[PDB]
Amino acid sequence: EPVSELLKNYLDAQYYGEIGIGTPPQCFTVVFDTGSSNLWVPSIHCKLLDIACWVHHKYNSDKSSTYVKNGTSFDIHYGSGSLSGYLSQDTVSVPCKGGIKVEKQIFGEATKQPGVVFIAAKFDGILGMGYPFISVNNVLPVFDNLMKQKLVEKNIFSFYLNRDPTGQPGGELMLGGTDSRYYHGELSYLNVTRKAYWQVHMDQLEVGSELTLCKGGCEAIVDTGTSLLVGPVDEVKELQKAIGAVPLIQGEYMIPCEKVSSLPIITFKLGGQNYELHPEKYILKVSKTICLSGFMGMDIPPPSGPLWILGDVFIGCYYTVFDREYNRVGFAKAATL
Ligand SMILES: NC1=N[C@@]2(CO1)c1cc(-c3cccnc3F)ccc1Oc1c2cc(C2=CCCOC2)nc1F
Ligand SMILES: *[C@@H]1O[C@H](CO)[C@@H](O[C@@H]2O[C@H](CO)[C@@H](O)[C@H](O)[C@H]2NC(C)=O)[C@H](O)[C@H]1NC(C)=O
């Protein structure tokens, strides 16, 4: 009864699986993003002269018998850029072909995607798996709608993200259960503080034994739609100096690959349990073979911030369970090889 969704892994930075929209299903690749709450894919009704209109697969409402028109225009903004379009209603299949059919799901037909962001993305769109409180246009999210249709037993979903770039599979989303093959030991849970993002209280962050960040407590979100670990700019700048990383030309922080195994252990201490990240795990190897820091400084302003983002680096190292029945997040050491 729980549904397994294969995930592809692009350079440890993007994790996306296949879904279907319409009857017959039109296949789209989406990032299952716990940092938003809307489902949107590109539309055929984009414009010939926009470059985003030539990149990803497009929703064609003519070819769907289950399509019904909503038409309400939407406009979505965030850090990297923005997109806009109008809403539609159709059946959503997970996966595109064991699977389930979510009926009467309102989503977004993106007709304009300015910026250079979406050109870099190997995925067509986004399926938000956050709370309804951050859903633009107050659109009932996919997971909320599927639980209303009682399509899985448990009001939970779980993420395995393989941080081995060449390994297979790239990851696995588990709708309605948890996959014990992909984690050792037992799960330990944190209560969600703010039901908007998957927000969590963090007691402190220890970079070795000489630098303590998030001093006196701070707030964090568990976000599968963010590649790296993100914290306040000033705090992460201390972290990069403590590990000796220097900013490159593009902004990435680099550290010589010889010095990796001599770098301190970084412990995220939240909710009575401690979560270790050894230097081999919070430092990425990119191609030349150059080693980059897994941390990124970004000031998220109020009311949402300041926030730490436990992105794919953290989730790829700890199997994560998102639980809407008891509003809590679970962690367990992910199985490797
Ligand atoms: N968690 C998170 N999702 C992102 C940004 O941060 C987002 C992430 C990505 C992204 C990029 C690279 C790898 N993985 C990703 F998920 C791409 C597009 C994108 O685009 C959006 C995102 C979030 C949002 C939200 C809109 C309204 C609610 O607040 C966030 N909107 C987007 F268009
Ligand atoms: C989809 O279109 C409808 C009507 O064009 C929009 O209005 C919703 O309609 C429902 C029908 O029962 C009413 O409860 C409300 O007037 C609206 N619902 C909500 C949740 O706002 C609607 O906004 C559009 N989008 C969605 C996601 O329903």
Ligand SMILES: *[C@@H]1O[C@H](CO)[C@@H](O)[C@H](O)[C@H]1NC(C)=O
């Ligand atoms: C989390 O919240 C639930 C709500 O009742 C409570 O039962 C549980 O003890 C809480 N856990 C912690 C660690 O505070």
